[model samples]
Target chain A: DKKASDVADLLQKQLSTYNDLHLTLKHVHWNVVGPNFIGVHEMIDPQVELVRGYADEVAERIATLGKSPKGTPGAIIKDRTWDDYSVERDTVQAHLAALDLVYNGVIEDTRKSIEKLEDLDLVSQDLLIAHAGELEKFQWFVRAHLESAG
Target chain B: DKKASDVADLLQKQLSTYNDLHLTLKHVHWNVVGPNFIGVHEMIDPQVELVRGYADEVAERIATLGKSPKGTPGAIIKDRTWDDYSVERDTVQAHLAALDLVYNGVIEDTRKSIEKLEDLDLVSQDLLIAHAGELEKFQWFVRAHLES
Candidate 1:
C-alpha cells in the first residue's frame, strides 16, 4: 500500500511537470523570433506532444494503482515543482536557453524519481526510465541549439 | 534461440526505419523555410530525438536478446524500405506535407509490427505500442501545422 501510494505520488508529480512543459513548449512555439526560426519553431510541437504522451502514461499508471491523478490546471499549477516560463516574446536564443534550463530541471526530477521508484516498483521505474531517456534526449536537442548559438 | 533471433530481426527492421527517419528529420530541419519556419524548424528536433530514443530502446532490446543491432548508415539505408526524401530546401508547408506522408508510413508499419509481435512477445509489443503512440502524436503535430 505504501508502495502503491508512493508510486502514485511520484507519477502525479511528473504529470504536472509534463503538463507545465507542454505549455512552455507551445509558448516557445508561438513566440520564438528571428533567424533559425523555422527549425526552432517546428521543433517544439513534437516536444509538446512527447510531454503530453508522458503525462498520459503517468496518469494511466496512477489509475492502475487505484489513485486519481491531479489534472486540473489549478491543481497542476499548485503541484508542479518546476518554475513557470514567462509568456512574453523572446529571441530564439533566449527561448532555447530557457527551455534548456527547464528540460534539465524536469529531467533531473524524473531521474531522482526513478531512483526513488526503484525499490517500490521496477515496472514503474522502467516507465520512468524510458521517459527520462526521452526527456534527456530533448534536453540534448535544446542544449545543442544553445551550444551552436554561442 | 529462434524467438530471440526473431525478436532481434523485428528490432533491426524498426531500427532501420528510425535511422532513415532521423536523417529525414534533419533534412527537413535544415531546409524548411517560410512563415512557419520557427515552429516547423524546432519541431523536427524533438521528433528526431524521439526516433533516436526508440532506436536506442530497440537496440538495447536486441542486445538483451543476444543479437547484434545493425547501426551503420549503409546498413540502415540498405535495410530500410521507406521511401527517401528529396534533400532540398522547400517551403514549410511542402516539408510538412512530405513529413506527414513519411510519418504515416512509419506509423502504419509499426502498427503492423506490433500486431505480429503480440503473440510472440508481449514485452516487445509494449515497446512498439509506446513508440506507435509517439509516432501518431508526431504525425498529428505535423498535420496540425499543415492544418492551421
Candidate 2:
C-alpha cells in the first residue's frame, strides 16, 4: 500500500528530525554555560527523553505501517535537505541563539510533514502538529531566557 | 454530517479540558510560594499561555469540522466527567502536585479522545496525540521537581 508507505515516508522524515534534535540538544546541554546554566541544562534532559520517545514512536509507527525507519547518523546526514547544527561549545546565550536556528529548521521541516500528511493520514499528521507546537513552545522558553539576557 | 459532528463533539471535550487547565495553572501561578517561588512562578506563565493557545486551536478546529465549541464555565462544569482542581493557595510543591493530578485528568481525557478519533479522523486524532504528549512531558517537568 503506497498510501501506507507514504504516511511512513513522512513520519520517517520526522523520525530523523527527532533523532537529530535530541542529539543536538544533548550537545547544547553539555556545551551551554553562563547564567541560567542549570535551568537550561535541566530543561534539555526532559526534552531529550521526550524526543527519544518521539523517535521510538515514529519508528514503531513506521513498522506498524510496514517499513524500517532509518535512524543512523549517516542516514540522517544523507537524507536531510538542511545544513548541520553549526553551534559548538559556547555560552548559554550563544548556544541558545544557535539552537533557535536549529529549531527553526526542525520545526519548519515538521510543519512541512504535517501539511503533506494532512490528507493521507490524520494520525500521522496529528503527531507532527503536536510535536511541532511543543518545539515552538520550547523555543519560546529559550528566547525568553535569551531576551532577558539581551 | 453526523460524522463531522462526532469529531466536533470529541474536540469540544478537549476544548473544555484546555479551558480549565489554564485557569487552574494560572491559579497555581498566583498562589505558589516558598523558596523556589520565583522559578516555579516563571515556569507556569508559559504553560498557561500555551494551554490557552491549545484551547483556541481546539475551538477553531471544532468549528472547522462543523459546530461551535461551547467554552463557557457553565458548559465546562456541566460536561466535565471529573471534578474541580482541588489544590488551593499553597507551596510550589503543593500546587505542582495538584497540577500533576490535573494533567492526569486532562491527559487521560485527551487519550480517550485519541482512541475514539482513531477511525473517524486522523487529523483530529493527531491533535490530541500532539497535545497529550505535551501534557505528559509537562508533567515530567513537574515531577522532576517533585522527585529531586
Candidate 3:
C-alpha cells in the first residue's frame, strides 16, 4: 500500500515539472516571429494549452488523494530536476533549441517516475506512464522537425 | 527574379528540418522503454509515422518547386543543425531529454527557412511555417515531461 504522503510527493514532483515546461512553451510561443510566425505561433498555443491541461490533471489528482498540494514555488523549484530559469530570449532557433532540451528532459523524467511508482506497486500511477507515452509521441514529432532539415 | 532553383533550394533546406526531427523521433521511438513503454511506444510510433508523411510532403514539395530534396541521410548529417547520432539509449528520461534538445534545433532552423522564403515572396512556403507550428506544439507537450 502506498502512503498518502508518497502519492502527494509524486504529484508535487509532476506539478513542478509541468510548470517549468509550460513556462518554456510560453516563451517560445510568444517570441516565435518570422515567416513561420503564423504557423508556429498557432501550433504552439494549442500544445501549451494541452500541457497545462495535463498539469491541472496532476494537481487535481493530488487534491483527490486528500493531501494538500505543495503551496510554494520554492518547494517545486527545490525538487525540480530541470535547469534554473532564464529570462534571456535569444534567437528564435536558440529558444526553440532551449525548449527542445526542456521538453525532452520532461519526457525522460516521466518515464522514470513511472518506473518508480510501478516498483512500489502503485499501479494507479500508470496514468502518468500513459501520459508519458503521449509525450514521447509528441517528442517524436518534434524530433522530426529537427532532422527534416535534410 | 529568383529562379526555380532558388525555390528548390529553399524547399530542401526547409524540409530538411522535419527530416532531422523525424530521425530524432525514431531514435526515441525505438529506444524508449521502462515505465511508460507501452503507452510511450505506441504513442510515438504513430507520431513517427506522421513525420513520415510530413517528410514525404516536404520532399515532394521540393521536387515540385523544381529541386531535388536532400536525398541521403549522409547529406542530412552533413548540413543538419541537429547532430546525427545520440546513442545514450538508457532510461526513459534520458531519451526524452535528448529528444527535446534535437527538436528545438529543428524549430530554430525551420524559422530561419521561413524568413528566407518570405524574402523571396514565396508565400506558398507558408505551408512550412504551419508545419513548424505543429512541431512546436509537440515540443511543448514533451517539455511538460521534463519540468519536475
Candidate 4:
C-alpha cells in the first residue's frame, strides 16, 4: 500500500506540475502583447508544442508503471500546483513577470519532486531530475526580466 | 576621436557580454548528466545557438553602425566579463546558477545599450531593444531552473 501510494503521488505530482508549466507557457502564447509581441509570441509558440509532448510522454511513462494517465482537462486543472495571474495582460514587462512567477513555481515543484523521488529511493526517476535541471535553466532566463530591472 | 571612442567602447561591452552569455549556456549543454538527457539536452542545446546568434548579430549590428566589433579571444580577457569555466562541467543545478549569473549581466548590459542608442536618437536601435526582450524571456526560462 505504501509503495502504491508513492507511485501514485509521484505520478500525480509529475502530471500536475508538467500540466501547469505548459499552461503558463500557453497562456503567454495567447495573451502576451506589445512592442516585442511578434518575437516573444513566436518564440513561446514553439514551446507549447514541446511541453505538450512532455505531457503525453509523462502520461505514457505513468501508464507504463501501471497507472492511469491524468490527461483529462478537468484533471489537469484540478491537480496542477502552479500559481499566477490570468489578467488582461499588460506590457512586455508585465507579461514577463507573470510568466516568471509560474515558471518559478514549476522549478520549485520539480526540484521537490526530485528530492521526494530520492527519499523514496526511486532511482528510476533519475531522468526526471536531469530534466528538472533544464526546467530551472529556463527559469533563470525568464527571471532575467525582473533581475535586470533591479 | 570621441565619437569613434564611444562606438568602440559600446561594441566592446556588448561583444564581451555576449561572449560570457554564450559560454554559460555551453557549460550546461555539455554536462547536464542525468536521465532526462534526451529532453534536457535538446532544450539547452537550442539556447546555445540562439545566444550565439545574438552574439553574432549584435556584433554585426555594431559593424553596421560604423563600429568595429571588439570581440577577440584577448578582448574577453581584457573585458573581464566571461564566466570563468572549462568544457568538463557536470550536474544540472550548478549549470543553472552559472547561466543565471552570465545572462543577468548580459541583460543589464543590453538594457544599458538600449539607453545608449536612445540617447544617440538611433530609433533603428529599436531592433536591439525588441530582440533583447526575447533574450529576457529566454533568460527567464533559465532562471526558473535555480528557484526550486
* Ten-residue stretch with the least lDDT total in model 3 chain B: B34-43
User: After aligning candidate 3 to the native by TM-score, how far in Å is the CA of A33 from where it should be?
Assistant: 26
CA lDDT of A18 in candidate 1? 85
Candidate number with greatest DockQ: 2
The per-candidate count of clashes, in order, stands at 20, 5, 35, 27
Residue B14 CA displacement from its true place in model 2, Å = 0.8
The sequence of per-residue lDDT tens digits that candidate 4 reaches over residues A43-112 is: 4666667666667766776776667877676787678655445755666567767776777677677777
- Scored by Cα lDDT, where does model 3 land? 0.67
Tell me how far candidate 1 lies from the true structure as C-alpha RMSD in angstroms. Answer: 14.1
* Interface RMSD of candidate number 3: 12.1
Q: Estimate candidate 1's alpha-carbon lDDT, on a 0 to 1 scale.
A: 0.82
Find the candidate with the highest TM-score and give its number.
Answer: 2
DockQ of each: 0.04, 0.08, 0.02, 0.04
Q: Can you tell me the CAPRI class of model 1?
A: incorrect
Tell me how far candidate 3 lies from the true structure as C-alpha RMSD in angstroms.
15.4
Let me know the DockQ for model 3.
0.02
The residue-by-residue lDDT of candidate 4 on B1-148, one tens digit each, is: 4554565567667777677666756666656542222344556677778777877876876677677786777777788655476534444556666666766777787788778867563643575687688777877877775676
List lDDT for all candidates, in order: 0.82, 0.80, 0.67, 0.65
For each candidate, give the TM-score of chain B.
0.95, 0.94, 0.84, 0.79
Off by over 4 Å in 3: A1-150, B1-3
Per-residue C-alpha lDDT of model 3 across residues B68-102, encoded as one tens digit per residue: 78857776766565556575556666776777787
Which has the higher lDDT value, candidate number 3 or candidate number 4?
A: 3
Q: Which candidate comes out best when scored by lDDT?
A: 1
Candidate 3 vs 4: which has more DockQ: 4
